[PDB]
Amino acid sequence: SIVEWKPFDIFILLAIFANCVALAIYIPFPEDDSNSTNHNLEKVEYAFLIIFTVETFLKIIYVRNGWNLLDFVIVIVGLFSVILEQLTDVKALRAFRVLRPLRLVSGVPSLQVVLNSIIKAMVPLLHIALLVLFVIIIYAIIGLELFIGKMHKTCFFADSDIVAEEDPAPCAFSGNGRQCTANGTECRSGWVGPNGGITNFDNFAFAMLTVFQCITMEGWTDVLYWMNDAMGFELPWVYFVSLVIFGSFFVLNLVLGVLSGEFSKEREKAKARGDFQKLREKQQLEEDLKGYLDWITQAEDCRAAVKSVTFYWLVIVLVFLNTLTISSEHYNQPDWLTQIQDIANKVLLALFTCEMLVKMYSLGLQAYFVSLFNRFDCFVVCGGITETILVELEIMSPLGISVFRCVRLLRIFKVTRHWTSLSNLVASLLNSMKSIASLLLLLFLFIIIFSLLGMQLFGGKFNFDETQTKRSTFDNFPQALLTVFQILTGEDWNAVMYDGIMAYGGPSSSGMIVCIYFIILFICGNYILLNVFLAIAVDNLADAESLNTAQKEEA
Amino acid sequence: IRVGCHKLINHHIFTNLILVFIMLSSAALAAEDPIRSHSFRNTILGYFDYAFTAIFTVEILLKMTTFGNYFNLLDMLVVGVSLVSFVVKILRVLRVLRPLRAINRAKGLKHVVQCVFVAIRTIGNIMIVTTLLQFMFACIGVQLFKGKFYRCTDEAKSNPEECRGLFILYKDGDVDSPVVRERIWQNSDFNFDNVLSAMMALFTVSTFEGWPALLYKAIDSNGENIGPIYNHRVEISIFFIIYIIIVAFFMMNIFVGFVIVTFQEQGEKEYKNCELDKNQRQCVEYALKARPLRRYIPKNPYQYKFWYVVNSSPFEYMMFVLIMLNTLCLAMQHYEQSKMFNDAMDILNMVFTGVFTVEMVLKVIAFKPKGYFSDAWNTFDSLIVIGSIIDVALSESITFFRLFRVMRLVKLLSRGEGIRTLLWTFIKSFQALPYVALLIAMLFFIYAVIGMQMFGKVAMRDNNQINRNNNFQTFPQAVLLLFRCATGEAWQEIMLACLPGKLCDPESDYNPGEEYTCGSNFAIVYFISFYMLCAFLIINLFVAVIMDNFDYLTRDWSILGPHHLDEFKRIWSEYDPEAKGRIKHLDVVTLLRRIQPPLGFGKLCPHRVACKRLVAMNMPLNSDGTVMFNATLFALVRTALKIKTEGNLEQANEELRAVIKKIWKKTSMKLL
Numbered sequence A: 001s002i003v004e005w006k007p008f009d010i011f012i013l014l015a016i017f018a019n020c021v022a023l024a025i026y027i028p029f030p031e032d033d034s035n036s037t038n039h040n041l042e043k044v045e046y047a048f049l050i051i052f053t054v055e056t057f058l059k060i061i062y063v064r065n066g067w068n069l070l071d072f073v074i075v076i077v078g079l080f081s082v083i084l085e086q087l088t089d090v091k092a093l094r095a096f097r098v099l100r101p102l103r104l105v106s107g108v109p110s111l112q113v114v115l116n117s118i119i120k121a122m123v124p125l126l127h128i129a130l131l132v133l134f135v136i137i138i139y140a141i142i143g144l145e146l147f148i149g150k151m152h153k154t155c156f157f158a159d160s161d162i163v164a165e166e167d168p169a170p171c172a173f174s175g176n177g178r179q180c181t182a183n184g185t186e187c188r189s190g191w192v193g194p195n196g197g198i199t200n201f202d203n204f205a206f207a208m209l210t211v212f213q214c215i216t217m218e219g220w221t222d223v224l225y226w227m228n229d230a231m232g233f234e235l236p237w238v239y240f241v242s243l244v245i246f247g248s249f250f251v252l253n254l255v256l257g258v259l260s261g262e263f264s265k266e267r268e269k270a271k272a273r274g275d276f277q278k279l280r281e282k283q284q285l286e287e288d289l290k291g292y293l294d295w296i297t298q299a300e301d302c303r304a305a306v307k308s309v310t311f312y313w314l315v316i317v318l319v320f321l322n323t324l325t326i327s328s329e330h331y332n333q334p335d336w337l338t339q340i341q342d343i344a345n346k347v348l349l350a351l352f353t354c355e356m357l358v359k360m361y362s363l364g365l366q367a368y369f370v371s372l373f374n375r376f377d378c379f380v381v382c383g384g385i386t387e388t389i390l391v392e393l394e395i396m397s398p399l400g401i402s403v404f405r406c407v408r409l410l411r412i413f414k415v416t417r418h419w420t421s422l423s424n425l426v427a428s429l430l431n432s433m434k435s436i437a438s439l440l441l442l443l444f445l446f447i448i449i450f451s452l453l454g455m456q457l458f459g460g461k462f463n464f465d466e467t468q469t470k471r472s473t474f475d476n477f478p479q480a481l482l483t484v485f486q487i488l489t490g491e492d493w494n495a496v497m498y499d500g501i502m503a504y505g506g507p508s509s510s511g512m513i514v515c516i517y518f519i520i521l522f523i524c525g526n527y528i529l530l531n532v533f534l535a536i537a538v539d540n541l542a543d544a545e546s547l548n549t550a551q552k553e554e555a
Numbered sequence B: 001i002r003v004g005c006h007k008l009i010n011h012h013i014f015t016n017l018i019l020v021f022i023m024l025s026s027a028a029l030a031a032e033d034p035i036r037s038h039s040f041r042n043t044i045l046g047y048f049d050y051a052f053t054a055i056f057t058v059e060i061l062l063k064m065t066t067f068g069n070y071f072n073l074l075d076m077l078v079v080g081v082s083l084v085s086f087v088v089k090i091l092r093v094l095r096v097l098r099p100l101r102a103i104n105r106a107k108g109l110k111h112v113v114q115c116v117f118v119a120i121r122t123i124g125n126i127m128i129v130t131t132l133l134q135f136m137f138a139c140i141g142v143q144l145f146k147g148k149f150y151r152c153t154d155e156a157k158s159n160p161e162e163c164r165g166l167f168i169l170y171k172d173g174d175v176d177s178p179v180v181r182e183r184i185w186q187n188s189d190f191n192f193d194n195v196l197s198a199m200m201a202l203f204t205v206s207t208f209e210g211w212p213a214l215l216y217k218a219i220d221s222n223g224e225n226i227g228p229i230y231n232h233r234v235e236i237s238i239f240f241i242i243y244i245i246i247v248a249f250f251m252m253n254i255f256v257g258f259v260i261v262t263f264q265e266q267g268e269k270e271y272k273n274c275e276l277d278k279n280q281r282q283c284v285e286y287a288l289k290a291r292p293l294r295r296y297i298p299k300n301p302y303q304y305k306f307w308y309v310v311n312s313s314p315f316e317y318m319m320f321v322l323i324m325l326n327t328l329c330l331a332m333q334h335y336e337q338s339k340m341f342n343d344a345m346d347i348l349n350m351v352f353t354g355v356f357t358v359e360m361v362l363k364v365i366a367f368k369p370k371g372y373f374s375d376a377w378n379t380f381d382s383l384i385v386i387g388s389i390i391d392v393a394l395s396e397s398i399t400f401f402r403l404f405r406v407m408r409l410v411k412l413l414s415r416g417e418g419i420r421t422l423l424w425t426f427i428k429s430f431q432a433l434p435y436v437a438l439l440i441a442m443l444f445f446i447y448a449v450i451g452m453q454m455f456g457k458v459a460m461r462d463n464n465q466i467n468r469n470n471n472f473q474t475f476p477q478a479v480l481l482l483f484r485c486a487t488g489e490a491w492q493e494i495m496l497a498c499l500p501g502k503l504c505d506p507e508s509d510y511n512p513g514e515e516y517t518c519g520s521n522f523a524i525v526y527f528i529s530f531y532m533l534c535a536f537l538i539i540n541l542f543v544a545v546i547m548d549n550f551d552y553l554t555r556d557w558s559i560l561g562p563h564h565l566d567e568f569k570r571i572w573s574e575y576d577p578e579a580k581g582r583i584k585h586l587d588v589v590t591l592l593r594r595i596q597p598p599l600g601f602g603k604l605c606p607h608r609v610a611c612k613r614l615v616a617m618n619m620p621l622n623s624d625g626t627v628m629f630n631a632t633l634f635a636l637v638r639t640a641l642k643i644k645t646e647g648n649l650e651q652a653n654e655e656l657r658a659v660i661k662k663i664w665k666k667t668s669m670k671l672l
C-alpha cells in the first residue's frame, strides 16, 4: 500500500481506457456470426477481467463508497458471466461491461465533481418531472377513453388480404373520417396499425408511449393525421394541439425557468467569494500593458503609414476580394471563372506576402508572437504559399485542393478582431476553457457509454425488414455513435425506437420493454445537454456583462 | 371647426369603436375563400370591405382636420391601397396590413413592440457572428460536396452517361411484381452546389429537421459527377457534427442566455434599496398588505361532530386512496376485452359513482350549501358527480361527462406545496403578460393570411406534404400548418411542396392548358422568415414569463419564504372562523407557540425567550384583548430580522414611507 500511491491509480486508469477502446473495436455481427478480431478480443476481455478481480481482491486488504460498490458489482458480474459461459441469455448478460467507462469518472475528480454538481442540480426539477408524469397519465387516460381501437381499418382490396396502399392510413371508424376512393378497394377491420401497431391508443402502455412521443415534439402530427383519418376533423385537433402546448411548451418554460434561476442562484453564491474579481483583476492589467509596451520601446527603437486608415481600408478591400474569390465557386462553373480565380489567388497571395514583409520590417518581430492574431496570420500565409507551390509543383494533390481553400478562408478574422465590443465574451470563454473541456468530456463519456450499450442491445438486430437497409443502426462504433448523437438532437428518435422495438418482437411479447432505453437516452441525454451548453452561456456570459460594466466604470 | 371634432375623437368610446371595427375587419379578411374567386361568400365579404373603407376614410379626414407621425402614414397606407382596388395579387397580399395599425391604438401593444425592437437591437452582435460562421461553414461544404449529391432513379447506374432510358422497377422489392419506370439523373433538394444552396442546407440542418438524411447523403458522396457509394466516407460526418455542436448547441444557447441576462439587467433598472434589500421587499410587503383567512368553524354540535368526521386527515387519506383506485381501474380498459371484464369494470364504475354521490351530500350536510362555493377546490367536486349520475343512465353527448370525470385526479392530487404554487405563479405570470401572446397571435394571423393568398391554390395529393390534413385552403388549416412549422416537424418538406412547379386544384380559376402554375419562389423566404420570427417571439415570451417570476425562481428558501406567512395566516384562522380583524391576547401565547422555529421561536421552552421578548419588543398599547391583524405580523417580522432599538422605532416608519409603497392611511397604528 506504500508504493500504490502514484502508479496504481494511473495503471487502473490506463486499464479502464484500454478496456473501453477494446469494447469500441468490437463488431457485433448478426445471427451469432464472428471473425478473428472478436476471437482475440474475447481473450483480451479475459485478461482484463483477471486484472480487475485481482485489483478488487487486493483493494480490500471497500463497500461504503458507491464507486467501489459499482466496481465490485461489475467484477462479480463478469465472473458470473465467465463461469456461466465456461460451464454451459448466455451473451445477454454481456451488457454489464459497458459500466467500465463509467468508473473512469471516479478516477477523475474533476469529471466527478462536475457530475456531482449536475446530479445535485436535478433536485428542483423533480416537481416538474412529477407534473409531466401526471399530465402524461391524464392524457393517456383521455386517449384510452376516446381513441380506443380505431386505427384498424385500412383500404384493402376486393376480397383479399392485401393492403391497397404503399403507405396505408386508417379509414373511417363510423363513416366520419376517410373513405376509400379507388374503384376496386374497400376497407374493413383486422389491420395491424399505422406504425406496425406501436402507435395507438388501444392500451394503457401504448397510450402512454404515444402521449410521451407527442409531448417530445417528434411525430405528433403523424398521430394527429391518423386520428383525422380515423375520426372527423373536429375532436382530434383539440386533444393534440392542447397536448403540444401544455405538454412541452409549458413544461419547457418551467424547466428552463428553474435551471436559469438555479444557475443565477449560483451566481449570487459565487459572488461572495469574489471569482469575478479575479477575472476583473486579470483583465484590468491587460489594457495597462499595451500602452506601456509600445511607448517603452518606440522612444529609442517609418510606421505612421502602415497604421493609417488608408492601410486599414486597403486590407479590408483585400480581404473582401479574397472572400469573394473563395465564395464564387459553384458546380459546373465556367472555365474563365476558374482562370480568374487562380489569377486572383496568386495576386492576393503576393500582395499579402508583400504586406506581411513590409509590416515585419517596420513594426518588430518580437511584438508579433505576443498576440495570438499575428501567429495565426503567419500560419495562414505559410499554408497559402505551401498550397500554391504544391499546386504548381510536381504534385497533383487531388483531395488537398479543397482542404487548403478552407485554410485561406479564415481571413475574415483579421477584420473581426477589431470588434472590441464582443471581445468580452471571447475572453471569458477562452479563460473558462478548463470548465468547458470538463463538461464537454462528461457529455462525450455519456455518449460513448450509451453508444456501447446500444451496440450490445441492437447490434446486428436491425436486419428484420428484409426489404431495405437501415442507415441509423448500431452496427459498428461510428454508426452507433452517430445514432446516439441523432437521438440526442431529438430528430427522428421515434423511428429508431420503433426499429429497436421491432427488433425484439414488435408490439407483441416482451420486446417493448426495450423502449425505455430510448426514453432514458432522450430524457437523461437532453438534461445533460441542457446543463452543459447552458452553463457556458449563463456563467461566462453574465460575467462578460459584469466585466463590461466594470470596464465602463473606468472608461 | 378644428376644435369641433376634437371632442368626438378624444371620446371614451370612439377609440374603442374604431378598434372593434378594425378587429372585425381583420376577422372578415380571415374568412375569404382562396380557392374560388367567384363565390357567394367572397361577394358578401366584398360588400363588407366597402363599408370599412368608407368608415376609415371618414376617420382619416376628421383626424387630419383637427390635426391639420409615421404611424399615421401606415393608417393612410392601409386605406390608400384599398381605394386603388375596388397586378392585383400584389395589392391583395399587401392589404394584410390591416391589423398592423392596431399597435398605435393600444399602449400595451406599442410597449411590447418597442420592447421587442429593443431586444432585437441589442442582439445583433451575436447574429453577425452566427451568420459569419454559418457562411464559412457553407463555403467549406461547397468545397466538400460540390455536385456530389447527384444520383440516378435506379441504384444501378453510377453516372449520367448511362442513367438514361427506361428501367424495370420491382415494387416493394418483390421480384414477381415488376414495373417499367424512367430513370432520371436527379439532384438532392438540399445540396451544396453553390454558396446559397449550402447556406439553405445548413440552415435546415441547424433547425434539426431532416439532418440525418443530409448526413447519410454526404456520407455516400463519392465524386464530382458519379452516384453514391454505401458508407463511402463515414469520416465526413465530422463536418456535420462540428457544425451542429458549434452553431446549434453552442451559439444558439448563447443567444437565449444573453437574452435572459439582458432581461435580468432590465429587471434591475431601479434602486429602491435605500437601507433594506430585495429580501425585505417580498415579506415585509406581504406583512403590511395582507388579509386574514376564513375557517368557518360551525355550530349546532349535531352538525359539528359530523363536520369533524368530515374534516379530518384519515378521511382525506381515504378519499385519496379511493380516487387512486378509481383511476387505476380507469386505466385498465384495453382493446377487445372480455365480457366479464367489461361488466366488472362497469359495476365498479357504478360503485365509485355511488361513493362520490354519497360523499357530496355527506360533505354538504356538515358544510352547508352556502359555504360550498367558498372554496375553489370544493366546487370542483360539486360539478362532477351529477355528470357521473347522468352517464350511468345514458349508458344503457355520452362521452362528455365520461371524459370530464377524469379531472378528479389532478383536482385532489395537486394539493401539494411545491407543484400547486408553481402552477399558480406561472399562470399568474401568464395572465400578467397577455400582450406577447397577442404578438404571437398577430404573427400567426398575418402569415396564415399570406399563405392562404399565396399557396392556397396548390392541390392536395395523398402522397405529398400538402395533403387533406395539411393545406392552406382555409384559415384554421393554415394556422394548423403554421403551428406544425413552429414545432418544426417537416417545414422544409412543406417548403419543397410549395415550390413553383406544382399542380393546381380543379376548383381554382385558371386558363385551360396551364395546370402547373400554382406555387411560387416566395416559399423559401416565407418559411425561413416565419421560422426565425416565430422562434424569436417564442423565446421572447418564455424569457418574459421567466423574468416575471424571478423572485420565486431565486427564492432561496434556506432563509425565508412566503410559506411561513401562509402558515402564520392559517394559524391565525385556526381559532378564527372569520377574519373579524382583531382578536384577544390570551390565545396569542398559543399562536406564538404554534410557529416554526425559523419564523417563531426555538424548540426551547418559551419561559426564557418568548416570554421576555413579548414584553421587550414594542407592541401597540391597546387593551388586554384587542390586538389587530396588521400589527403582530409586523412585530414578528421585526423580531426575526431587521431589529431596531427602542426610541428609534420611527426610523423604520420613515423608511416605510420612503421606500415601501403607499400606506393608504393604515400605518398610523403600525407606527406604535
Ligand SMILES: CCCCc1oc2ccccc2c1C(=O)c1cc(I)c(OCCN(CC)CC)c(I)c1
Pocket (backbone or CB within 6 Å): B120, B126, B127, B128, B130, B131, B206, B207, B208, B248, B249, B252, B255, B488, B532, B533, B535, B536, B539
Ligand atoms: C426577429 C427576427 C430575427 C431572428 C433571428 O435572427 C438570427 C440570426 C442568426 C442566428 C439566429 C437568429 C434568430 C433567432 O431568433 C433563432 C434562430 C434559430 I435557427 C433558433 O433555433 C431553432 C431550433 N433549435 C432547436 C431545434 C436549434 C438550436 C432559435 I432558438 C432562434
Ligand SMILES: [Ca+2]
Pocket (backbone or CB within 6 Å): A217, A218, A219, A490, A491, A492, B208, B209, B488, B489
Ligand atoms: Ca423533428
